[model samples]
Target chain A: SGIVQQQNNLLRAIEAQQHLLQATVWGIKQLQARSGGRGGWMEWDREINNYTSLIHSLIEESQNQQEK
Target chain B: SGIVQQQNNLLRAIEAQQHLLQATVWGIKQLQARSGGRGGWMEWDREINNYTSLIHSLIEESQNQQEK
Candidate 1:
């Protein structure tokens, strides 16, 4: 029960974080598209990809941790 | 030549992101440490760890992409 709760807590937090990061990227990119906006789009894409790769691993961890 | 240039751009961007992210985490952690600050610190550590893991991989990718 403790392990499951802990896992759930982790998953919930991770999902929230992922969403927050996604918003950050989207908002910044939108600004960049608008007026260069201190643009480093290459940088943007890199950070997005890097975060994505990490998200996948966390997803996988959550998936396995979910069973009886 | 193109690949080298592209890789350089990616590396530079990644470094910048890494630094920027570090600043963010530091700032957020400081805030979280004070008062309540909408606390979800378990979430924070997970996000930080998730990002850090991804950054390391990007660093490796950057290293391999470099050469004559």
Candidate 2:
């Protein structure tokens, strides 16, 4: 029971971190928009995508841990 | 002892997430470098700073939880 609760706490933290990551992406997107079709916008989008990709990986890892 | 161990696990996960955030920052920096002297680069750096800032805040929150 304790372990399950602990896992829940961890999963909540992971979700919170994922939300923060999304906020970061949104902030970057706002900057990109304000920059007036800048040269590096596509590259910036790709780099931001990596953060989201990492969060998805973390979620998968969390799910795997829950199964264990 | 179980509670302390759980706390340790959570702290370690937070640290791991922080490292991933740092890696994301590094990836963005690499893109910035390859883009020449771009207009949006500085804004991008500031947006990325928010991610690092969130990680530091998370670290502080974790420490506070440990103290509880």
Candidate 3:
């Protein structure tokens, strides 16, 4: 029971992280629209990349935790 | 690419939810420490159980999304 609940919690956490990332992407798009330039798009892309990497790291952490 | 990005975003959302749950757990622990009773512990346990169920539901939803 404890193990099952723990895994469920971890999976839920992963889903929450993904939702935040989606919101961030939407926000970046809005910013790009307001800025209206290739530079703005580039900046938004950079931010997305950074956040994506962070999410990846968290995923790795979660996976490691599951293994243990 | 789009699917990968979407999955990443979902994972981020899951992480945020887990952080919230963790904070709630900490708060309940503090309350138990301050109140000092078996009653407090029981209440905390109930709350944790509720949250655990909620997290399980979220995980199911995420898994369904991934399948699609």
Writing each residue's lDDT as its tens digit, candidate 2 over A1-68 gives 64465455556666666765675566446546555655767877787788788878888887887886
What are the per-model C-alpha RMSD values against the true structure?
A: 14.4, 7.0, 16.1
Query: How much RMSD separates candidate 1 from the native structure?
Result: 14.4
Score residue A55 of candidate 3 by CA lDDT.
Answer: 81
TM-score order of candidates, top first: 2, 1, 3
**Ten-residue segment with the worst summed lDDT in candidate 2 chain B?**
B29-38
Error of 2 at A8 (Å): 9.8
lDDT digits (tens) for residues B1-68 of candidate 2: 87778677776978797688667656655654555444656765665566566656656665655565
- How are the candidates ranked when ordered by DockQ, highest leading? 2, 3, 1
Put down candidate 1 lDDT per residue, A1-68, tens digits, no spaces.
43344334445445544554664455445445645554467875897789788887878776875864
Taking all chains together, the TM-score of candidate 1 against the true structure is: 0.45
The prediction achieving the highest lDDT against the true structure is: 2
- What is the alpha-carbon lDDT for the whole of candidate 1? 0.57
- For every model in order, the TM-score on chain A comes to 0.71, 0.68, 0.53
lDDT of 3 by residue, B9-60 (tens): 7556665666765665565455445545345256435545565566557666
True contacts preserved, each candidate? 0.00, 0.07, 0.09
Q: Name the regions of candidate 3 deviating beyond 4 angstroms.
A: A1-4, A30-35, B1-56, B59-68
Per-residue lDDT of model 1, residues B1-68, tens digit only: 56456545645665666676667666655654553443445665665667667655545544543432
